[PDB]
Paper text:
DNA gyrase plays a vital role in the compaction of the bacterial genome and is the sole type II topoisomerase able to introduce negative supercoils into DNA, a reaction coupled to ATP hydrolysis. DNA gyrase A and B subunits assemble into a A2B2 hetero-tetramer of approximatively 370 kDa forming three molecular interfaces called N-gate, DNA-gate and C-gate allowing DNA binding and strand passage. In this study, we reveal the complete molecular structure of the [name] DNA gyrase bound to dsDNA and to the NBTI molecule gepotidacin using cryo-EM.
To allow better positioning and refinement of the atomic models in the EM density of the overall structure, we also solved three additional structures with better defined densities for the ATPase domain and DNA-binding/cleavage domain (5.9 Å), the DNA-binding/cleavage domain without the [name] insertion (4.0 Å) and the DNA-binding/cleavage domain with the C-terminal β-pinwheels wrapped by DNA (6.3 Å). The local resolution near the NBTI binding site was estimated at 3 Å, which allowed the identification of the gepotidacin density. The molecule intercalates in the DNA duplex between positions +2 and +3 forming hydrophobic interactions and pi-stacks with the protein and the DNA, at the same location as previously observed for the NBTIs and crystallized with S. aureus DNA gyrase22,25,40,41. The main difference in the binding pocket of S. aureus and [name] gyrase lies in the subunit methionine residue (M75) that is replaced by an isoleucine residue in (I74). This position is part of a [name] hydrophobic pocket that accommodates the pyranopyridine ring of the gepotidacin.
Author numbering:
A (entry chain A), C (entry chain C): 8 to 252, 256 to 422, 427 to 443, 446 to 524
B (entry chain B), D (entry chain D): 402 to 474, 483 to 555, 737 to 790
DNA sequence: GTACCTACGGCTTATGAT
DNA sequence: GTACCTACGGCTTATGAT
DNA sequence: ATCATAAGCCGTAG
DNA sequence: ATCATAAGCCGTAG
């Protein structure tokens, strides 16, 4: 059985590959800025029950669990991703606090996956706040036997804080980091006024920020980058000339993502080839007090010309291709700053609304059960005889259902909304009726509930639930309250995890 | 080349044997353990293969085991293994490596593709079991009308013989050379690759 | 600070290594015949909750869990051990039922640890029957934060059924497999009579058994092996001459642990070197109907002389060095058959006694609680008033403790032994008193317990517990009952998992 | 040999530098990242090393990087690295590989052992933390009188500098050659190995 | 995605030497 | 116990050629 | 005196 | 005509 097939088949096959790399492998999202790998790893660490204030765990458990349940793509990629998240000098705000040999700036690879230990950091739980309260949708795993969140209920605009760098089939992306307090101030300014221009945002957000500080030369670069979506920016190391009371060059900090050993060896090679002039030797003194490279100026040289020649030919000055590309509703779109901020705020509104609805419904059901429990606690004796005479628990339940109740005067809320929706109008018309759910709730009491110290507790809980459901209905009422709440939460987040600028933008 | 990986059959007369190509150690094991030992052959591979257009250099050669085993390369002279088949997993990387092998064959030896010797296999996709009711599903449409194997190196070898390499039940697929067009030109130019994925 | 040290230090260091290889790495035990690796793997699979009648699981989860919690010695060794346990042709009774490419007799290595699936087999739960009932001691893990069983509560004499092969620093061990029903018959014969000789056991146990059948030549070998502890035994393949209505050699099954491809290639080499005569070609026809190698006899040859020449020079006949060494109480000792059987029976007695004591104590405590619950269910009304008047639950408990009770005539066992040991004689002298435990047990009732359908249930449970504790005290009473129970359990095990001989011992 | 693994120091005058020997990638990383960069040196190894007595063959040589880096081998002629130290983990394999290296030094170059150049290190064994109370424990007896590190490639490099390679706080250990005895003969003869472990 | 090097003892085969 | 080979795009440096 | 061509590196994946 | 010596392989471990 060999049916004839055209060669055009090729296209189809290849096309499929493209559609699986752009969507689910490389390009991050605009709503939370997380590749699917990071998402699944964080979700697994949370489900395993490994918070920040507990003891560490070996990498083997986490890696094996992630490979087993959620991410079926081998092991080396996952462990490399974890090691990348755990490094301090490669993310502005690290997420996975670890213990072991995670490499360093020297380019040394990390240790094996049977020595290190990992756990979440305090900022990690802010990404995953209120995950269980039905805020986002769930998607099936590879075989359709588990659930995975689609997008995280974030509180931090992660896409602007950490950025990413991925390469798809037809597209490619690259975004620099930033600072947290500045982005929060920008978001607050945008919440204050909806039709803000780019001038105000560029005034609140000066420019990028890097894990290891440096100096930035041009403003035209970042301006054209934020306004359109593409641009270049220069990164310049920090150094200075110095003479004791001959000349000497001291280097404190290098640009972003540059091997130190390769730099030293390349400079040694340049000196050996005579392509550059005025360098005698080269020494390193890096210690626990900051990085420090020393270069001895050849006698009878200004040195600053040597410095400019280095800046021209050395890795000490390197370019960076800002290019913003991400997914908006499942399609790549070049997006500027304003669009990212608007998307973040919309996501936040949606999450808050859904969480509020959920908590409202839960408190509603709880109060509904406790009403009938209080009514049953009112009349204690006739229920005792009705149960003692009824042989069958089912018949006792039915007898409790059938008759009305006296509703003692010590028992006898809002006009409405203290009762669920799917409850028909023929329950709770003092006259009162019950329901099978309420019936078994009554049948599931204890004898501790019959003292003079639980009646007041039930009354207290009932009043508290009334107040809470009233407040929730109000916060669902008008948009102004919602915006105030988002403002307060963002201000709290700002005050908790703030810090100071590291780099320094000097105008040309 | 000839030793090491290739495990040929007992028959030597051409125009009667077969050859397969799969991922190396995950699959080749079950492939050897479940095949027939008369007119079957297996050549495992390693990972991926470099494009022929994106980097063409007659000195650029790393594995070349195919060009050493199939013929001497000037394809009309030696014509051994008059029928070759490509098996690969059903995931996306399967289709990717499939495209790479097909463009290799099309841009290195056009005649062996023209005379109808290359074949594509069709592994199943789902196994449904309702008590006694067993069912093999090969495509998405069948599953829609009605366990998921994400690699040939996951099922039992006897199942592999029953479903993929049985000369009575296998469902192969043949390739042709209908026209001389330039899709393989928009393959790697960074412009077509940027415009062609416009599938709205 | 550099104190002078002697060179003798060396010895000490090296000596330590020895003491850690003989005890905890290679040599198995006499009580259950399991290296520590197998023990920890089985315990992890049981704790993870992966029985035989459930869905499979990926190897990554199990391997990662074992490396994380119990066995800190890398990954390759553990996965190789699992693959070895999962092969059919390398164990007489496999333990880990798997799915995937576990290699074959051809010498092909198994697949990666991200494709296969594993679970326990039905015989595995017989090794670990009654593990939670406090039958064996627990030892701390590498850091002292978990627990591991020391020896398994086995029901099968595993050391004789599967055997092992390990190499220590100064010692080495090797044991062949056997058949199950024969070993069970031998154990029953030893239970019948304590002072049996080796003749009777050798009559009940003919000889070894292999996963792939073969032919054994000598009896002197296995006789000297079972009697002393050392010996050699020959293994001969099965083949025969055949002529149609020329000569041809057909081979069906090969000896124990022989690569087939290496054998074929070595025979091809011998034919090529002319060292052997009378072979023309060599073909293979192995299919799903058994292994089948065909060799074409060169024309004008008896062939049987060729067969004997092969048996002389080919791997088709191979020797085997039976040498029994194992740990007895933490020290290697060369042990014969009788000693192994005696040790097994002693272990079984100990396990049964401890399990019986545990279940007795548990049923005792249960009956003690239910007595007071029944007494409280007798008098229902005064307890209701005593609780309604008492405001504090603590004060209500104390008031329940302070006064005696009426012990209604519908309420009012053995002479004694229906009450725990640590209960003082001042409780339960109809007169009756309570205890704080009983008090809170009463305070933790429900309203379902007050119908006409739970009173009979409580009476039934009480009578049943009385009968059970009487039976347990009897089985602890005299040794004859214990021996009868062990006999019955061994007979049941025999009847469940029996099978037939594979090899065939032919006298010289 | 000289490139690849060995990362020497800035000082070149002998009789002032130091050298270490550890397991390769798990440890050497932290060792380099936490050492001093003036008069320190590191030479990672790979796995285990073949015995010198059990298989002695002047042609049998696989790594030989030690014999290439330390001197030219005829040890009196070149005498570089007048002080060498052996670090290894506290588990049993540590003691095993320690015994192997010591028998190598004793049976290849007796003089470098006699003049007192070989040193043994003493890594800590436990870290006790009761709120603010921190405590380093090095042996079993101290732990008895009062986290467990099962590899040097597990602690932070700064802790390594504080506890193992600080010229003010490290507690090394020196070796001597007291007598000429035959313990290294009962090392590998299969008879002494069978009688010597009689520790009741 | 995949190949090499080591330790521990008890068995064989293979090879040139009194 | 440890090293090499591949794909995807956008940047640099390095080199011999109109 | 200017330009077409060929190499490394960044991150999830065989 | 007989013998001391040197090599592969089996399974948990660096
Ligand atoms: O394939 C090769 C070929 C050559 C080679 N040389 C050196 C080397 O180190 N390696 C070489 N290799 C490859 C690699 C060995 N490889 C084996 C598998 C291992 N996997 C680690 C692991 C996997 C899992 C773990 C833990 N650790 O727990 C969860 C389940 C899966 C990584 C190292």
């Amino acid at each position: 059985i060999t049916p004839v097939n055209i060669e055009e088949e090729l296209k189809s096959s290849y096309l499929d590959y493209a559609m699986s790399v752009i969507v689910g492998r490389a390009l991050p999202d605009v709503r939370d800025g997380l590749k699917p790998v990071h998402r699944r790893v964080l979700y697994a660490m949370n489900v395993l029950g490994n918070d920040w204030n507990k003891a560490y765990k070996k990498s083997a458990r986490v890696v094996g669990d992630v490979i087993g349940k959620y991410h079926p793509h081998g092991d080396s990629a996952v462990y490399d991703t974890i090691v990348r998240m755990a490094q301090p000098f490669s993310l502005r705000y690290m997420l996975v606090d670890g213990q072991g040999n995670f490499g360093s700036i020297d380019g040394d690879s990390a240790a094996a996956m049977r020595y290190t230990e990992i756990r979440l950091a305090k900022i990690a739980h802010e990404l995953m706040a209120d995950l269980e309260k039905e805020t986002v949708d769930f998607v099936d795993n590879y075989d359709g036997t588990e659930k995975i969140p689609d997008v995280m209920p974030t509180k931090i605009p992660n896409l602007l804080v950490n950025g990413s760098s991925g390469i798809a089939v037809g597209m490619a992306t690259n975004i620099p980091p930033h600072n947290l307090t500045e982005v929060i101030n920008g978001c607050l300014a945008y919440i204050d006024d909806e039709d803000i221009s780019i001038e105000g945002l560029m005034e609140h957000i000066p420019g990028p920020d890097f894990p290891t500080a440096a100096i930035i030369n041009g403003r035209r670069g970042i301006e054209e980058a934020y306004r359109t979506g593409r641009g270049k920016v220069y990164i310049r190391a920090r150094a200075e000339v110095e003479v004791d009371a001959r000349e000497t060059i001291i280097v404190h900090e290098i640009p972003y993502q540059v091997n130190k050993a390769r730099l030293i060896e390349k400079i040694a090679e340049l000196v050996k080839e005579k392509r550059v002039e005025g360098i005698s030797a080269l020494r390193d003194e890096s210690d626990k007090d900051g990085m420090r490279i020393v270069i001895e100026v050849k006698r009878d040289a200004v040195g600053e010309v040597v410095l400019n020649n280095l800046y021209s030919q050395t890795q000490l000055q390197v370019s960076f291709g800002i290019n913003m590309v991400a997914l908006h509703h499942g399609q790549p779109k070049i997006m500027n700053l304003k669009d990212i901020i608007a998307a973040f705020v919309r996501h936040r509104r949606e999450v808050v609304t859904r969480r509020t609805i959920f908590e409202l419904r839960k408190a509603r059901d709880r109060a509904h059960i406790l009403e009938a429990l209080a009514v049953a606690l009112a009349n204690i004796d006739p229920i005792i005889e009705l149960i003692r005479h009824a042989p069958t628990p089912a018949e006792a339940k039915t007898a409790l259902v059938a008759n009305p109740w006296q509703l003692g005067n010590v028992a006898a809320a809002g006009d409405d909304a203290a009762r669920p929706e799917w409850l028909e109008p023929e329950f709770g018309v003092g006259l009162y009726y019950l329901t099978e759910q309420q019936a078994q709730a009554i049948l599931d009491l204890r004898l501790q509930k019959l003292t003079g110290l639980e009646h007041e507790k039930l009354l207290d809980e009932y009043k508290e639930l009334l107040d809470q459901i009233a407040e929730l209905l109000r916060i669902l009422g008008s948009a102004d309250r919602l915006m105030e709440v988002i403002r307060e939460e963002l201000e709290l987040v700002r005050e908790q995890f703030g810090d100071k600028r590291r780099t320094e933008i000097t105008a040309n | 080349g000839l030793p090491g990986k290739l495990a040929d059959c007992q028959e030597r007369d051409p125009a009667l044997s077969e050859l397969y190509l799969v991922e190396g150690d995950s699959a080749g094991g079950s492939a050897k353990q479940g095949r027939n030992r008369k007119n079957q052959a297996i050549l495992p591979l390693k990972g991926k293969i470099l494009n022929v257009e994106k980097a063409r250099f007659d000195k650029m050669l790393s594995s070349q085991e195919v060009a050493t085993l199939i013929t001497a390369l000037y394809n009309p002279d030696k014509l051994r293994y008059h029928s070759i088949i490509i098996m690969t997993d059903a995931d996306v990387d399967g289709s990717h490596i499939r495209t790479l092998l097909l463009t290799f064959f099309y841009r290195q030896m056009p005649e062996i593709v023209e005379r109808g010797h290359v074949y594509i296999a069709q592994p199943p996709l789902y196994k449904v079991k309702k008590g006694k009711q067993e069912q093999y599903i090969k495509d998405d449409e069948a599953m829609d009308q009605y366990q998921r194997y994400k690699g040939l190196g996951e099922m039992n070898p006897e199942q592999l013989w029953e479903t993929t390499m049985d000369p009575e039940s296998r469902r192969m697929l043949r390739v042709t050379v209908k026209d001389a067009i330039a899709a393989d030109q928009l393959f790697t130019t960074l412009m077509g690759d940027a415009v062609e994925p416009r599938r709205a």
